Amino acid sequence: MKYVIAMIRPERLDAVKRELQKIEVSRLTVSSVSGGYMEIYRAMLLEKIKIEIAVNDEFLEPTIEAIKTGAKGGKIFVLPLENVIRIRTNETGPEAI
Amino acid sequence: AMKYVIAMIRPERLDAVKRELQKIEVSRLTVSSVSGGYMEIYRAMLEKIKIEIAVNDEFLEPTIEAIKTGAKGGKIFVLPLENVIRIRTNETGPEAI
Amino acid sequence: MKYVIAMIRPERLDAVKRELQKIEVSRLTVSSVSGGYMEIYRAMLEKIKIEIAVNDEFLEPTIEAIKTGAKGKIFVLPLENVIRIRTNETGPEAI
Amino acid sequence: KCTTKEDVLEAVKERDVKFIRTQFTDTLGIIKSWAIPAEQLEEAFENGVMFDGSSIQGFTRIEESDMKLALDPSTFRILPWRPATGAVARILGDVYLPDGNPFKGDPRYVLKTAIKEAEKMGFSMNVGPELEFFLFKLDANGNPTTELTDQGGYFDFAPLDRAQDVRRDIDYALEHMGFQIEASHHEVAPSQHEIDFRFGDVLCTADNVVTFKYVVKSIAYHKGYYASFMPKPLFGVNGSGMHSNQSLFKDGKNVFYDPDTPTKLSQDAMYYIGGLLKHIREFTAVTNPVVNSYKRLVPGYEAPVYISWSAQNRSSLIRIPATRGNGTRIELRCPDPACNPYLAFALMLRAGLEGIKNKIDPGEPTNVNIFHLSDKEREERGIRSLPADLKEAIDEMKGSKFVKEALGEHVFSHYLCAKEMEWDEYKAVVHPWELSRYLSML
Amino acid sequence: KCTTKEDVLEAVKERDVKFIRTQFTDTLGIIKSWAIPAEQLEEAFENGVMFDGSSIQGFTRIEESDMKLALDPSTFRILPWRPATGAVARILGDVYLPDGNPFKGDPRYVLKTAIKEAEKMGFSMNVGPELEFFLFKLDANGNPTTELTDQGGYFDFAPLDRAQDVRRDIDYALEHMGFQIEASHHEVAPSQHEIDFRFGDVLCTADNVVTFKYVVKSIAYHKGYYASFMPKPLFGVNGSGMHSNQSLFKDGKNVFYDPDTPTKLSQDAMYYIGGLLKHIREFTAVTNPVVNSYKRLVPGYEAPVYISWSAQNRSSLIRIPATRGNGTRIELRCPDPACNPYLAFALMLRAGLEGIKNKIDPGEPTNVNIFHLSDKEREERGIRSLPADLKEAIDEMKGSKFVKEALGEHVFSHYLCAKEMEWDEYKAVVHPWELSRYLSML
Amino acid sequence: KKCTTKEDVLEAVKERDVKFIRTQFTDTLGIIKSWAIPAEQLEEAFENGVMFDGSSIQGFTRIEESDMKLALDPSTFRILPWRPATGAVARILGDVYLPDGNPFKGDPRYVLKTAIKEAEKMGFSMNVGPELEFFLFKLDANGNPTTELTDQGGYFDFAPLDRAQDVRRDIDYALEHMGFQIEASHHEVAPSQHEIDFRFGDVLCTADNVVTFKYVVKSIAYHKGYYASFMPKPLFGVNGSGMHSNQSLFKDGKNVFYDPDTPTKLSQDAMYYIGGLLKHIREFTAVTNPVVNSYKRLVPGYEAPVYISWSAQNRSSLIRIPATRGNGTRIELRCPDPACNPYLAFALMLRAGLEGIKNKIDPGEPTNVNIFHLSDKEREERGIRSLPADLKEAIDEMKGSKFVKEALGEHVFSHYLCAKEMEWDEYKAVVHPWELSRYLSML
Known about the structure:
It is classed as lyase. Keywords: Glutamine synthetase, GlnK, PII, complex, dodecamer, trimer, T-loop, lyase. This is part of a larger assembly, with three copies of chain A and three copies of chain D. Chain A is 23% helix and 32% strand. Chain A has a four-stranded antiparallel sheet with strand order 2-3-1-4, with helices on one face. Chain A is of the alpha+beta class. By secondary structure, chain D is α+β, with helices and mostly antiparallel strands. Chain D has helices at residues 5-14, 41-47, 54-57, 107-119, 162-177, 202-221, 267-279, 284-287, 293-296, 341-358, 375-381, 390-399, 401-407, 409-427, 432-438, and strands spanning 17-22, 24-25, 31-32, 35-37, 49-52, 66-71, 77-78, 87-91, 93-96, 124-138, 144-148, 183-186, 192-196, 200-201, 225-228, 242-250, 253-254, 309-310, 318-319, 330-332. In chain D, helix 5 packs antiparallel against helix 6.
């Protein structure tokens, strides 16, 4: 299993969500975050968008390239996630995503 | 071992979860306002709550069902936690949570 | 590699950052979360979540920097991959 | 689709519905409602709901007023706003007297009897209504006004300010309740709009015209605007109609279509037009129900003030559009959106059915501009006009045996007594226009 | 269910309840309260709470003024708002004199005695009250007005603006403290509403009517509106009543139901009605307590100004709804929401009980319009009026042994002296209507 | 946990980010005084004391000793119920010393401590529960105080139910979680009027708490957009505000006013205590009722008493004895208003009661009738005297009193009477708008 976190330019949140749905990835979670090219602008860290996804190993490559394409026009963390359980159905691991 | 449990609930169930967490004495928790076709009819007129709990392994399943009971009336993602450090006590590991 | 999550008092955010820059760790993720000291105050707790992707050598420098800057909890998770997008670097170099 | 009361109870649980509103009309068209907590609903399905029948029939007489509403699950529809408290739905049903007989005074019942009459002859009736309305501003206290939101005209792309979003939000709300809008456009007058319903079964369509009115009003109110269904809010510009396209069907085929005739119209269509023309004068008080209705029925605008039928002319009282085949339809142009749609469609269905039964020929079409003619020309042509004000429409209805038997006596007399009261109140009023014309003169 | 003080203290801890509020009324139906910190609650359950009895009985006399409230844990209820400081709950109890006997001047104590007397016959009382109020606007300084929030009428779907959301929130708040609304609807007057509650034991119901008033008011204030329970806030539209439906039960069965009589009413039902008809004139002063109450009891509106019962006429003083079975009920229509509900429901209960014990025939029903009769016509029928004003209601009650024994002497005398002062103040006021009628004239 | 040492205080400052410390004291007349010490200066303050100008207590009127030392009292350290962005704030109190190391006798708190020492020489300690009535008004558009009402409720009404409902709850919550331990609060008789009832408690800590209550309540109301007024009589024609003072004496935790073997279950020494209080109350009414406006509340028709009498049954006597017995036996004195110096006023109640116990001062019979409805001769026959009618009349009574002079000390006695004399002389010469309304047309 994987837990995917993507920090994307906020203007591309919906472009990636378009490529995300195309490969049957719907379980996401969107956060507002922030992390000297932008120094000139301080009179008039920069805000990003954090997207969290748990995907199966079979969808890992589709998931990242969906995020790559919709964000290119950021950085994708790939994490080793060992446990994923659904709340309503006592589901575990691959069944719970 | 210990774990970081990320749970997201629809916001009106937060305090049923607080109490169910309190049943087995789990109060050290972090809550974030997150944004994560039933709801399509309403776009002319959806916010979740993210909960993050560090637990020791022995409270692993008691915490999942406590959040399950308070929230059902969301999903639970449980992660590998390598280490936790208490700043006031400089405790590391299980005693730190 | 490493994914570090830190929740510091919001009053000490950049004191943590000054300690973080000094060991040349500069890319972080700042967010506002919430976590009986404060009960007396309900008539008139908020935290800062800092997410860092250090590597296994700047690992303890990063922890002590946040430990130092915020003094006046830390969570450590395994990071398996990182992809820079504007460069497509992956792994330690993408950090 | 909602079919059983278990369908509705599951949807209530699944979609977090906390309130159910009933939806009905009184005799005179006003939309009526009471709110039911979701917790009370399973009991409501089991035993019906008691309520006061003065809501439909009024207070003016001592008559049975303990009524029972039996909920029709298949009419359960979730409203297109989401309070933090939880979701809201509407539901309809059938009204019964304490003995267990249906209450004949509910307009929706009156429509259901008309539907039964046509089914006795093989037919079922479709309607696609075209609803006109204005979008106005609210004053500082959030009160309705007639202040304009644009100066646009016929089919313009207007408005283009904050009111553009409100108009789009109105279309969105209805479509995603499940109305299946065909098309909407700016209409002739400044701030005037029109939404074209889907051609559908008459009973379910009448349910939809009632929902449409308060959904549109409530959506606009919450955006800072006002939606007005007055027939004629403004002198000197177009009034607002509810043109009513209609057809009959037998065995799933459109009986108004005949491929082997020159017009490609069957004879039964002509007998149906013939029946509609024979009786339209007698129930203009139902299609055009208020005093204001007769400020719209004056020459010079989209409103038809002359009894005639045409295919070509858009001026006619009855127009037959070009569409043939399964969408062959007859358009009746005189109704305005204040009518009670239950009664208005029922009387339309009964008039046309009486034409097919009695083989009433509609006479010749009228392809000329009738406003341009002289009285002797119209007289020679036998082109009669509609009632010129509400009182004339009251007098015509009161004499009509056809309207009385179709509506039923309780509804017939209640309707006329209430319109007779509204007219007597109006006719005594000294209006500002009279002070301007006469105060300095006399 | 809250049953024990241990149930309450655990729920207070678990749900972060920081403040407890007591809930009682004075002789005149004013709602009274004081705030207990949740840290004081364990001591309060153990020792009672000492408070000044001048809160209930006023200041006009030297009498025992140090009372003790013994908290009743089963009346603990969390209120439907969540302050940042922590949750809030209301609680009730029984009031005791220092010598240890109950305080008889508590209106709740007056209701328990009627409950206790009715239990000597094996009878228990249920009430489903229907509360009408007006939803008015606040002015610029946040203070009440009588400015309308809509112009709707009976059973309308209105308001459809921001006040649509206030009305929903009010229904939602009550339902989710456990009121169990049956239904709510727009009432006859503009901006007027009614909430109909489920049947419950008369003690729980009277406690809940007190809770309802301040809950509804506080909700409305916090949304920017005002909820008014005046009988007649506005001339020339309907006033607000508190129709009080009531059932009597024995051995588990509804005392008023008889499957074998032609109307399916039991004999005790008619005796109960006879008792109410006999005494109602003598405690109109209690069900209609203020000067403004008799601006509602004038002919022309929903208010019943004549003493009679009926099943057919919806406007009779006593009405029998068609419902039979375990839900057979008697609606007493004259009360208004300003009345002390403990005193009103106890007097209705005693009067009905008196009718049953002494077999008081109710006479014939009145099936016609009593207004449309002459003064001799109704005297031919022997139909009496309700008192025409407060002074008249006071004089009817001051000479009543039934009322004096039912309330007890302390309540009887206090109530009458206070109302007599209120009338003696109002009768000397020179109103602006008098200047308009007389200044130029005389 | 309880702060007992300076290290407890200094540890608590660290752990809770306390950035400023406020001293809390009163001048002769009862005006709340303070100054701000940064946390960084606090440890030195615990070591050397803090020097300050005694004119703050004794006024600028005379050339006298003026450089005082405040010896901070760590057990009086208490965190205030608001958290500025800058950090937590606390109050602390102390003992004022003259440069030679002797206590300054002009501090009201020392005056109370000497009465405490007298009661202790007889084996007693005094508890008090005050009842603070106040008004909640609106601010005008500039943020100034007004008399604009926030509600029109009456006695114990559940009112207000608008925005002010939340402010009232805020005030209750702030005091409780400061550590006050409120017993109850209600709406009082007049529109917008309120009462919060303190827990019975040690008299020194109670007087300390009454001062803290006054500015915590004002700051909470101000910051919410409202005004809390402790004026005795802000509005003619409705009830004024009082500070009824329930009190009792204890002999090592046994209530000395209780005696289970008597028909009323009150002790003899309770009645003597009442006798002493009634014997001297006229002579220090200028202390409990200290401003001109106090005597607009001391008029007939409302909750305010005007006649010197004691009673259990009659809830409107000057001295009222609640029905409670056992540990909670107390006597309520009803005349004081909340504008008074609680240190000077509790001290004179205690000194007066201890003299009644020492001299066996029989209080006479109780008056159970309504005293307003009586005639002068009946009152004269009963010997029922009345309190001073205005501040000047109260001052003169105090002027001739060696009991009050001895209890207060000559410094306080004379400072108090001079300043009150000056205030009356300012008041008396004013031509009021009521005079023009009555006389301009007439004369």
